[PDB]
Amino acid sequence: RLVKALEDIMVHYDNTTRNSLGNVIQFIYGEDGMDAAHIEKQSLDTIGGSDAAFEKRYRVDLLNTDHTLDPSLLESGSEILGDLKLQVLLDEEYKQLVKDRKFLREVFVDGEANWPLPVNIRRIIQNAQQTFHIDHTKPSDLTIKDIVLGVKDLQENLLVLRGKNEIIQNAQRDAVTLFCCLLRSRLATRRVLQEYRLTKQAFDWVLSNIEAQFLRSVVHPGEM
Amino acid sequence: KAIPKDQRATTPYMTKYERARILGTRALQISMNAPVFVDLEGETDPLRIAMKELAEKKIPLVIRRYLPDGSFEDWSVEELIVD
Amino acid sequence: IFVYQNNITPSAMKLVPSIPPATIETFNEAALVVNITHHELVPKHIRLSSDEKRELLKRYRLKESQLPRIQRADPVALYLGLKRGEVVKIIRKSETSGRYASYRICM
Amino acid sequence: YDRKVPSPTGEYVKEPEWVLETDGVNLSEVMTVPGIDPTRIYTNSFIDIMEVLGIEAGRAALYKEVYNVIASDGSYVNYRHMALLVDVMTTQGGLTSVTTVEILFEAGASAELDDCRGVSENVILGQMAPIGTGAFDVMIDEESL
Amino acid sequence: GQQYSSAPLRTVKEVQFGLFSPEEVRAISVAKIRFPETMDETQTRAKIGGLNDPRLGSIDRNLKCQTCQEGMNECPGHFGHIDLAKPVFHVGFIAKIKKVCECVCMHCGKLLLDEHNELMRQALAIKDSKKRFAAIWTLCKTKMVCETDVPSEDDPTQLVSRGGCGNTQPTIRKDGLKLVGSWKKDRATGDADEPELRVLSTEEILNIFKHISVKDFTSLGFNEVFSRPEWMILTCLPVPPPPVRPDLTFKLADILKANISLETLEHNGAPHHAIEEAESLLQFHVATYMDSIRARL
Amino acid sequence: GLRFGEMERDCMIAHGAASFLKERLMEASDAFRVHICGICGLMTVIAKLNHNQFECKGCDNKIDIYQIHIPYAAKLLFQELMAMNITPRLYTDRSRDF
Numbered sequence: 036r037l038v039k040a041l042e043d044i045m046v047h048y049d050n051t052t053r054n055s056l057g058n059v060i061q062f063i064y065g066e067d068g069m070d071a072a073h074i075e076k077q078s079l080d081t082i083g084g085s086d087a088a089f090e091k092r093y094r095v096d097l098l099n100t101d102h103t104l105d106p107s108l109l110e111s112g113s114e115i116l117g118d119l120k121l122q123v124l125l126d127e128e129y130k131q132l133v134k135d136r137k138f139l140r141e142v143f144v145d146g147e148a149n150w151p152l153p154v155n156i157r158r159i160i161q162n163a164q165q166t167f168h169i170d171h172t173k174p175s176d177l178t179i180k181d182i183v184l185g186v187k188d189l190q191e192n193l194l195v196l197r198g199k200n201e202i203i204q205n206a207q208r209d210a211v212t213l214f215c216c217l218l219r220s221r222l223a224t225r226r227v228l229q230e231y232r233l234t235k236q237a238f239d240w241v242l243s244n245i246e247a248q249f250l251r252s253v254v255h256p257g258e259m
Numbered sequence: 260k261a262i263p264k265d266q267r268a269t270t271p272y273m274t275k276y277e278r279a280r281i282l283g284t285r286a287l288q289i290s291m292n293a294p295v296f297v298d299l300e301g302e303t304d305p306l307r308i309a310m311k312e313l314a315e316k317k318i319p320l321v322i323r324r325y326l327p328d329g330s331f332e333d334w335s336v337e338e339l340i341v342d
Numbered sequence: 343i344f345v346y347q348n349n350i351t352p353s354a355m356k357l358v359p360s361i362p363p364a365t366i367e368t369f370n371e372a373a374l375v376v377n378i379t380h381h382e383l384v385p386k387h388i389r390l391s392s393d394e395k396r397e398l399l400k401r402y403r404l405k406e407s408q409l410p411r412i413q414r415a416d417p418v419a420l421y422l423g424l425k426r427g428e429v430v431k432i433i434r435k436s437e438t439s440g441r442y443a444s445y446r447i448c449m
Numbered sequence: 450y451d452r453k454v455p456s457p458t459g460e461y462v463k464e465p466e467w468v469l470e471t472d473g474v475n476l477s478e479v480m481t482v483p484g485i486d487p488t489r490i491y492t493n494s495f496i497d498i499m500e501v502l503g504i505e506a507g508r509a510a511l512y513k514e515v516y517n518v519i520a521s522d523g524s525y526v527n528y529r530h531m532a533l534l535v536d537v538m539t540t541q542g543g544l545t546s547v548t549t550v551e552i553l554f555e556a557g558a559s560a561e562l563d564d565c566r567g568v569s570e571n572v573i574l575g576q577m578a579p580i581g582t583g584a585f586d587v588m589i590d591e592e593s594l
Numbered sequence: 595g596q597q598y599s600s601a602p603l604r605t606v607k608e609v610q611f612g613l614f615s616p617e618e619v620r621a622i623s624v625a626k627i628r629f630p631e632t633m634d635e636t637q638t639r640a641k642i643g644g645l646n647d648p649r650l651g652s653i654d655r656n657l658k659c660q661t662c663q664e665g666m667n668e669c670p671g672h673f674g675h676i677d678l679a680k681p682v683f684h685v686g687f688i689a690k691i692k693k694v695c696e697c698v699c700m701h702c703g704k705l706l707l708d709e710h711n712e713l714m715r716q717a718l719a720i721k722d723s724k725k726r727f728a729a730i731w732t733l734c735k736t737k738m739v740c741e742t743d744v745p746s747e748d749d750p751t752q753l754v755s756r757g758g759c760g761n762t763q764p765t766i767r768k769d770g771l772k773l774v775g776s777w778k779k780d781r782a783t784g785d786a787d788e789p790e791l792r793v794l795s796t797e798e799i800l801n802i803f804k805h806i807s808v809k810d811f812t813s814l815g816f817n818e819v820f821s822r823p824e825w826m827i828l829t830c831l832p833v834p835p836p837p838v839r840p841d842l843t844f845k846l847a848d849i850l851k852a853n854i855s856l857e858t859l860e861h862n863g864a865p866h867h868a869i870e871e872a873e874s875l876l877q878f879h880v881a882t883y884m885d886s887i888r889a890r891l
Numbered sequence: 892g893l894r895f896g897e898m899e900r901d902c903m904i905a906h907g908a909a910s911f912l913k914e915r916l917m918e919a920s921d922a923f924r925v926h927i928c929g930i931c932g933l934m935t936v937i938a939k940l941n942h943n944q945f946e947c948k949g950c951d952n953k954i955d956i957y958q959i960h961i962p963y964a965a966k967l968l969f970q971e972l973m974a975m976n977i978t979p980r981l982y983t984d985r986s987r988d989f
């Protein structure tokens with residue numbers, strides 16, 4: 036009986052899910068436009084943890100000698116101590132990590148951090164680390180702006196809906212919110228330099244891959 | 260009721276279903292002695308030919324995608340990204 | 343809006359749709375002792391302007407009958423005083439996208 | 450019961466709470482009892498959930514009844530499949546259950562318009578069904594060199 | 595059929611169901627089918643301009659109809675017609691015809707309940723046209739009068755007028771292929787006991803249906819273009835070509851024997867009751883014809 | 892067993908295999924061809940293929956016409972339904988006059 040009731044629902048090339056009448060059952064399939072074969076359980080890091088621990092891991096304060104990026108992390112490290120306009124960006128990234136954590140604690144009241152999402156970022160990073168033979172003993176040549184603005188730009192290309200109007204834009208941004216929290220938590224500045232140690236070249240490859248993989252997770256029109 | 264080439268809002272990636280149906284329509288025609296567009300660097304098997312065709316982007320076909328309300332977009336095989 | 347303590351009469355309640363355009367809504371008090379739109383399972387329902395609605399339809403390219411429905415006497419619809427033909431946007435939390443919006447049109 | 454809740458320093462902790470559980474249901478009235486939290490009251494009767502709190506809150510109850518069934522056996526099915534079901538059950542605004550010549554006569558008199566998207570109708574007509582591989586048309590690319 | 599057609603070729607994307615009005619049936623006919631015979635002009639075992647070739651099909655090998663030619667094989671079949679001396683019910687809809695009858699006033703043809711009622715304004719709102727008919731019929735089957743004045747929503751000291759008439763309504767019963775009305779004046783007080791049974795001729799039903807408002811029959815699930823109520827009553831009857839018949843001719847024969855002799859009676863002047871009984875054999879043979887065409891397969 | 896029933900069909904729908912589903916559930920009952928008025932979708936069209944004349948007597952129309960191919964069973968099925976005063980009208984277009 037369930038097969039007879041659902042048999043006609045299909046995904047359409049607008050990404051909507053509809054019955055044989057064309058009625059809308061869902062405005063995007065699964066609320067996220069993904070195929071469930073391309074989704075894996077990942078932990079959303081912002082959500083858990085004490086407030087002290089979250090601010091050791093993610094806060095970069097370039098105006099403070101205790102709380103900046105050690106210069107062994109980064110080639111620019113000496114030169115960014117006390118720099119005021121980088122610290123504006125980095126404040127903006129932290130404010131976004133902070134909101135992220137609050138948002139997610141309202142979504143997941145319980146605190147459950149592990150949830151299926153597309154694009155297994157940890158395994159892309161571990162690959163980048165093998166593939167670029169990455170020495171944990173050398174500052175990286177990544178810059179602050181490379182990270183910060185590179186991660187913002189990537190979000191603009193994780194596309195599930197493509198319509199030029201506002202409405203479709205909002206839908207697009209709502210579709211990709213939770214993946215974008217996972218993303219900003221994983222590629223935040225202090226993690227990229229201090230935990231992952233990426234180079235520029237590795238980091239650039241991490242991104243372009245997250246993007247290809249994300250795009251290949253989108254469900255295909257026509258699926259029943 | 261047709262949607263101009265610009266302004267197209269559906270994916271630029273080919274879907275598994277389009278891919279399957281392409282390869283298979285083209286191998287049907289290869290199988291009935293239709294002219295081939297690609298170098299047979301050995302292959303005798305029509306599906307396999309077809310796929311080399313798809314890979315060299317030499318399959319001159321167009322996918323007409325209907326939207327639920329009757330309107331449609333035309334995407335050429337050439338242009339669809341194959342991932 | 344008129345709130346009453348335990349009933350109205352078969353023929354009182356007949357005086358209600360009665361002075362168009364001006365509408366009249368009745369509530370038992372007990373239904374109001376608790377605010378149901380504060381309950382965790384009830385997500386945020388937002389009445390769209392008739393413009394909003396025009397836009398919604400144009401961008402999905404839908405007819406009105408292709409939208410999901412909410413009935414006139416749905417509790418939340420009573421609570422927001424919706425009228426037939428009006429659309430709410432429902433914005434819900436979602437374990438797969440975090441946020442998701444859907445829409446129902448009143449019947 | 451244990452309830453995971455953020456602690457003053459930010460990490461999640463257990464905090465036990467007493468909870469009551471009943472045989473029988475009267476949601477509209479028990480909701481109103483002084484001393485309870487009316488925002489977190491529940492019942493496994495998703496019909497009553499829809500009658501008092503509305504279609505959306507019914508949808509979410511219904512999902513959570515179906516999920517419970519599936520998980521109580523110990524298995525795990527991705528969200529979207531049970532989401533789809535539950536949407537189909539609640540898109541007309543209520544909870545709708547999912548469980549020949551004669552009929553064509555009725556079609557006649559009603560002026561039934563068959564959309565022709567199903568697999569049987571397409572079979573009778575000698576066609577493919579606009580599903581999957583049939584949900585687009587393939588055409589000869591006269592625009593190419 | 596390996597021969598060529600300049601008519602562009604396409605798949606079917608929509609099927610639209612309805613009924614054939616008698617206009618459209620006369621409209622796409624070739625032949626008027628009147629004699630009920632195959633072959634022998636007096637006595638020539640060859641072909642007759644009356645049933646069988648009068649422009650529809652052909653066994654014969656002859657790549658011939660009415661300048662549409664092609665083989666006894668790539669010919670669709672063409673469609674015949676037979677004008678019917680009297681209206682008869684379509685057997686398939688007797689029970690529908692009976693329920694419409696129960697929702698409409700049987701003198702003016704106007705819906706027994708309307709906007710002013712309310713239990714009926716909820717039934718009118720229903721979207722599914724099957725559940726809507728269902729629901730309005732449930733509210734009207736009861737209604738034994740065609741009101742004139744009715745309490746309005748508003749300040750009920752006052753009444754308000756509707757399309758009126760005031761006539762009492764039968765209680766209708768099914769007695770095979772005949773519908774039977776029974777009128778009263780009350781439910782047994784003073785003023786009038788003993789109903790007045792009386793059969794509902796096709797004739798009058800068909801006439802009441804033709805008087806029902808587009809608004810009103812739409813409200814009942816019918817459609818102004820594809821399906822009007824009146825088309826449930828046959829007046830003009832489609833004659834399939836020989837592709838359809840593999841012994842259904844033996845039965846349309848017998849229709850015409852009956853159509854021929856209902857007309858030769860109406861012609862002769864002839865008693866009320868003979869005309870009626872010939873009317874009823876017409877009906878039975880038209881009904882037998884289709885309840886036989888439940889041969890689909 | 893050794894069949895292809897309701898459940899098998901459903902699996903093939905899930906995979907999206909429409910061509911397979913059409914091949915397997917067809918008739919070999921041949922694809923008969925037929926002309927169809929585009930106004931009244933009926934198989935009423937008189938097709939003079941040799942002098943190239945196509946008319947709907949009744950829709951008064953010789954421009955809007957199509958060809959279709961359908962199983963013979965279906966061409967019967969439909970003429971059966973016309974015999975019973977039901978119109979099963981085949982249109983080539985979905986979205987209409989509007």
Ligand SMILES: [Zn+2]
Binds near residue numbers: 664669670
């Ligand atoms: Zn012919």
Ligand SMILES: [Zn+2]
Binds near residue numbers: 699704758759
């Ligand atoms: Zn009347």
Ligand SMILES: [Zn+2]
Binds near residue numbers: 932935949952
């Ligand atoms: Zn026509």
